[PDB]
Design a binder for this molecule. Structure first.
Ligand code: M99
Ligand code: M99
Ligand code: M99
Ligand code: M99
Ligand code: MG
Ligand code: MG
Ligand code: MG
Ligand code: MG
Ligand code: ZN
Ligand code: ZN
Ligand code: ZN
Ligand code: ZN
Lengths: 327, 334, 327, 334
């Protein structure tokens, strides 16, 4: 338990943006998703609130984690633990204090933990082009996203894995719809139109008598939740450079692997996947310029301005990569 | 099925019925009976031969026939409305719509193949119950498709999967380019049959009619994929919603069937202590009032707009719809 | 009311070989499996014993019944209800009194209930020959049987359908193995081996202090349960002629329908499936002589003299059909 | 297009290594490195070319290579033993056994293709855990296969399913009769790889040896499908269990890998609070003693019997097995 102290201390940062997730992954014996999720649940007192037997929770978490591919560079259990922990911080954003119910909170966190489960390390288009069984089952539409959801729920059926066994029928139905709405929203093909609404919304932004954001209908409450987890999934560039660079190393490794596979198959190599003609630095700045920043700028507003330290970090990291661009 | 190389008595009657394949109002139920319950197979085959689709896409005839029978075999005979007769009707209706003057020479053979194939598979393996029923019972289908367009996704998955059975790949001779294109259009069209897409689908159709463009010929102008697929989606959607525009004799048979299917679902919901879906309670129904509402809020608005787009091609269809609307209206007991 | 009293009265014969199962099918609005299963569960006190909530039982039964095809002439919910009821009678045979446990009883009945669920009305060979998805999934081996089991168990996951939610893990563990063993044995491909082994047991027939049969190991126990359900699945010829004749009209219609489909596809028409070259009477006599009678004669030996009247009804029916053979 | 189905600049070193493809003891680990982790693709391609299977069954070369890369891609790189290297090894081992003098000209080209294909797909998509683990956790796989030869059934289903991916149908030019016969043999062979069937397989192999028949040539006489398929099943079974009969240098690497996989399952079982499977507890292991036992109760009885069937073809293989058995014996801590 010598390191049990290190892990324990490391976890003390679970509420902080910039947790040493990679260290935790090492300290936990490659169980970042299980320990982090377990801490967040204990912390938010979700086990007692939803009467979740401790053994059941841990068995499901290990099972869920086990279904993330250890051989995949980016989309693995570490990325999952990261999006969970990040959504967890984004939920505690002052501008949302006491806004969401324990169920909505449970939904956001659960959705984050399962959002990429059983990811093969290749894109939807690659699965589509090859006529993979997954693309055939989902009609080439949000192939992976649909799959992530199905697996996430199916695993609840394994031995002692149903963590929602004590929710009421109504709670289960409401939880399930939200989890689905959120995960399906992680598909980058939804990003554009998804962003517009986050804007159109921040325009009419309303506050309560408590100074916290005001959300009425399901429509508005889910959009915030959708964009929120969507931000957590696209939060690598807003973290301290040290962590961010590791994520970039990982995503590039996954990209290049796909490119090697497309190349050996005589398939057109996907954008940014050709290791023989790459622009890692230039791609990061462009990624930040046309996608991440535009998204994270709006959320910075929405939770005005508890996201400041986060937005400045994004801009700082951009400059860094910018100064790394060859020629 | 023949003898000595000549059609049998039945076959000849059937062939004579099939002569109206290019006409709105085909005696589809008569064809279903005459063909030994193979309306989808015979109608699809007639249309493929009519449009020379076998040669154009090099589809071996035995493969086409084997796939068709296999596809038809996966529609449920015990389902009153959503069966092979409904599929054959939608195929034939789409076929007629494709040949409307306002669209002559607008679509490629591939887009034509896509609209017809999508129509043929659009409701395959339909269980006779709504998406919400599948969602409420936590069915495996709903679990697989995340409660989103459960049936429509299933219809597509099954339509394509059946291509893998013995000698069923009718697209074996298409290039990967053709197949990727064909597949995307078919998927776009069938997913658009989910009623949850009706409103937006109609909105865009209206918008298009607003900015409508033609050429030296009174033929519509469609540039991008977005407008071409929009028209194809609304075309098959209209076909799927064409029952009220057919001669009253046919329209009523369809109403009897959808009502039977609705009531059957209602009885299942009642057995299960579930809330009975709208119009599915045989004990508290208003068949006539419901057909009137169906026309006033859904069918007429859709077809009216379509008639604008292909004006004046759909005039008669529109007038028939209005005649049938009045008929049902006058049937409402007070 | 009336039709309700008629149904209630008909169900009174639930413990008798020769129940008017078709009449019950009509009277219940096509719910023979639901009403007969429910009746039998009450009769054996299974709801109390395994604490099965009544709403859960009814919902599961209707769900299971709904997954049998109404358009299938023979392999539909009436056949299922019939096998369930037939197994229920065989279980009460004197020579087996107090031999099986409540769990083993439950397994045999549940197995009977789900043994042909979602049957498409065509043989394994037809499915194999057309390269169907089911055959590909099950490697052409007991395709339908494996499928009936997978569906039967899967349906327990639908809303309020888990009738074993109160069984212990050990009970679930044992019940599942027994159900699997029983249904896989319904494949006619395993008939010959089943009969042989059954006979062997008839030779090593070990009685008990109470004069009832003696079964030590799981192997002998499951063997008797497998043959029992097998006999039930093959009991049509041993039932009152009015019933038997209906069964024959149904199986023949299913056979002929497959034969037409095979004819359509240019496939070789399966044995007895060609309506243009049929011999219904002749075929039934052959079915009794080479399969049904051999099996039952043996079962009669094991439970002597418990099934004398069943055996006599068979031999009687055999003659009826024989004399029906035109010349 | 590449010489070995895979691009490589070390092509020279790789080509040299592949010269021993017909030899027991090929340096498969070296080939995996030289091929860029494509041992299965490279070895299968080499064997197919060598046995002239591409021409004999009109298998397009790009199709073969795409299928192989696809098949190989579905073996898990994170699994220490049951991965693409094990697959490549069993394929190559079966290839050698098929060429043994006592079996010359006995099997048809189709049976040869079946044995080799079966060897290639026999452990595809293996999760690194046993059937029992999948059963006790109520996995979807066990549910689908009713807890019977769960993995073996899945390996077959995936191996065949993958033929449906883009340009992956290597059997597209086989007549219907050939496909049916090939499919049956492959299924019979892979299902026989389940250890639960080992004892019965051995017993039948022994019986065959006891009534062994040879033709006018010096080769084994196999009259019926039953005897033919039995020999092929045991052949692939021996290949799957051939690690202890390979040069010690290779055998120890295989041992390190299976032990790594065993212990990982052990840690997972421990985590979940499950009883730890035999030899899976890294805290109470006896690696050396376990290998001797494995050889004494399973591997040697099997190979001793196979050696009798093909006497004296496998004499050196048996000699190696025995030498290796002694090495581990002396490695046992006293
Ligand atoms: O598939 N997927 C879904 C959600 C999130 C991610 C993260 C994934 C991702 C994550 C971290 C990251 O770098 C860093 F943050 F670690 C990335 O760098 C690259 C060059 C865009 C990319 C992508 N987001 C958008 C991607 C696109 O390829 C493009 F770059 F925008 F073009 C896509 F949008 F898909 F077209 S890929 C990947
Ligand atoms: O499931 N589905 C998809 C596409 C088309 C159809 C035809 C289906 C249909 C077809 C023929 C028909 O009557 C006649 F034309 F046969 C119908 O009568 C009823 C009362 C609407 C309904 C429906 N269209 C819209 C339906 C709705 O339930 C409602 F009535 F409009 F509310 C829905 F829109 F779904 F809410 S159901 C059914
Ligand atoms: O699929 N299946 C599994 C178990 C039991 C049944 C009942 C099924 C059955 C049931 C009732 C019946 O008649 C009557 F009892 F209703 C039957 O008539 C025929 C000609 C044998 C057949 C069969 N049992 C054995 C059948 C065989 O075709 C043969 F006759 F033995 F050759 C088979 F064994 F399959 F080869 S088919 C059907
Ligand atoms: O799952 N599976 C199927 C076929 C072949 C293998 C190879 C697998 C195998 C392969 C190489 C090997 O060692 C070496 F050759 F690499 C092994 O070491 C161990 C302790 C038996 C085991 C097994 N064969 C039999 C195994 C058993 O656990 C037991 F040892 F016999 F008890 C089993 F039979 F399963 F009970 S596991 C594994
Ligand atoms: Mg994702
Ligand atoms: Mg539909
Ligand atoms: Mg059966
Ligand atoms: Mg194996
Ligand atoms: Zn993600
Ligand atoms: Zn429809
Ligand atoms: Zn049966
Ligand atoms: Zn193996």
């Amino acid at each position: 338990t010598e390191q049990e102290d290190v892990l324990a201390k490391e976890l003390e940062d679970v509420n902080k943006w910039g947790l040493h997730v990679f260290r935790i992954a090492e300290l936990s014996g490659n169980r970042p998703l299980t320990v982090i999720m377990h801490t967040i649940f204990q912390e938010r007192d979700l086990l007692k609130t939803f009467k979740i037997p401790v053994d059941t929770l841990i068995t499901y978490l290990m099972t869920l984690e086990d279904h993330y591919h250890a051989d995949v560079a980016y989309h693995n259990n570490i990325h999952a633990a990261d999006v969970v922990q990040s959504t967890h911080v984004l939920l505690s954003t002052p501008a949302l204090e006491a806004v969401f119910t324990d169920l909505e909170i449970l939904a956001a966190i659960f959705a984050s933990a399962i959002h990429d489960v059983d990811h093969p390390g290749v894109s939807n288009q690659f699965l589509i082009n090859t006529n993979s069984e997954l693309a055939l089952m989902y009609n080439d539409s949000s192939v992976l996203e649909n799959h992530h959801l199905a697996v996430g729920f199916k695993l609840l059926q394994e031995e002692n894995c149903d963590i929602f066994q004590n929710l009421t029928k109504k709670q289960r139905q409401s939880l399930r719809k939200m989890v689905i709405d959120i995960v399906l929203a992680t598909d980058m093909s939804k990003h554009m139109n998804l962003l517009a609404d986050l804007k159109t919304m921040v325009e009419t932004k309303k506050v309560t008598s408590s100074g916290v954001l005001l959300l009425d209908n399901y429509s508005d409450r889910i959009q915030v939740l959708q964009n929120m987890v969507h931000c957590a999934d696209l939060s690598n560039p807003t973290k301290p450079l040290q962590l961010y660079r590791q994520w970039t190393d990982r995503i590039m490794e996954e990209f290049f692997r796909q490119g090697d596979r497309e190349r050996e198959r005589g398939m057109e190599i996907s954008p940014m996947c050709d290791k023989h003609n790459a622009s890692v630095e230039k791609s990061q700045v462009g990624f930040i310029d046309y996608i991440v920043h535009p998204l994270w700028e709006t959320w910075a507003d929405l939770v005005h301005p508890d996201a400041q330290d986060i937005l400045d970090t994004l801009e700082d990291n951009r400059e860094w990569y910018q100064s790394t661009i060859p020629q």
